[PDB]
Amino acid sequence: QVHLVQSGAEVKKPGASVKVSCKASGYTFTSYAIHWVRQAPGQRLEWMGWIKGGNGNTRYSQKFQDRVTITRDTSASTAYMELSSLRSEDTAVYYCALLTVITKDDAFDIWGQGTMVTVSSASTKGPSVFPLAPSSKSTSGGTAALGCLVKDYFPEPVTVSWNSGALTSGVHTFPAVLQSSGLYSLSSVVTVPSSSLGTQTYICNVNHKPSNTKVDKKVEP
Amino acid sequence: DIVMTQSPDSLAVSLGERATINCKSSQNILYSSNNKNYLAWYQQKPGQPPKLLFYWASTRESGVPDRFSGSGSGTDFTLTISSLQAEDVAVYYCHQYYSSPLTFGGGTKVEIKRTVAAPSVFIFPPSDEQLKSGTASVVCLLNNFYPREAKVQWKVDNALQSGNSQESVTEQDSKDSTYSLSSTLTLSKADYEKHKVYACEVTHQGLSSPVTKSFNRGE
């Protein structure tokens, strides 16, 4: 399967530089061009530039020409985008994408998962994960709701899975809120059978790539 | 810079209804030598990368159900979803590759109008782990409701609280077209221990009267 896997989300202080990476697989890397696209807060998608994975020729948007360098590595099949002299307005999700591969041969369009770049001089902080345990106050109609509370982290984002991804039905991971401390807090919750609370195990997997911290927390009645 | 203008910016219809999305190209993006328009359509669900649907304006990508079609030429283009299904709640982007710089429409959010679902309310006392850090967070949960409009008020020892809770609503569920909401009341451990009844009061047009879910700090 063609996959573009993109390095983890990052916190950077203004003026610094960020080098986000795009690992290719599932296709001849030297035959197509890797595009880079910014999705800034609420704003629309913005093409930044492309590099051609064989001869390394680039072309850049005129919004980023002076601050971005796109490079590739034919050996590791990895394209890289480097943005420098970072402004707090560069906080966005950055994508690499084989945009509209329309060849006489094949037709596909693959994007990476995005790398969120936050540009800030604020205190960084990993998440404190506390259980939302099921109780008489969280049961209803044969189902029980339980969850994790992911409190006081900076910056965004945190990823939450359940039972290393084996649990997807009935999950709701909420949008994060911004506390007056400038720290973010979110909730991830799932509704499970209330008849099997003593035989089943529910562990939420919390991943804050900006700090490279992982936390798993077992939520018990 | 070829600007791409999408109309509407937000459309909401019932399950099965036809949604139409229009995109205007600021420059004519058909090439009369190969008789092709250089337009694509994308679909984006929150927390995910966009997903190609159409290329050359009308050519469907593999996987895309046939309720989706694309049409248009020159400066006026259209994305149509003949029978909206829950999976289609997303944001849709037109996009041109006629000239540099590559550009993208503003987006159109697609919502589904569904029947009234009253929230399931659950309340979550603070964990002892958090109380070891010296703070206490109470979580009110509003699960699977419609419409999105819902009111949540916190009460501590029967006093309506002010200014120490935060809350967010999810996007629309891609199964049952509902919304969920989590509110959090947070208090110092010192203030948490000065009180007994912690309660959340929920208002929603699926409820004829406010629902309260409460607990006493003891158990």
Binding site: A33, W50, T100 | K36
Partner: peptide, 13 residues
């Protein structure tokens, strides 16, 4: 007329 280097992954043929 269209610039074919805006996305070189598109073959106009």
């Amino acid at each position: 007329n269209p610039d074919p280097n805006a996305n070189p992954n598109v073959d106009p043929n």
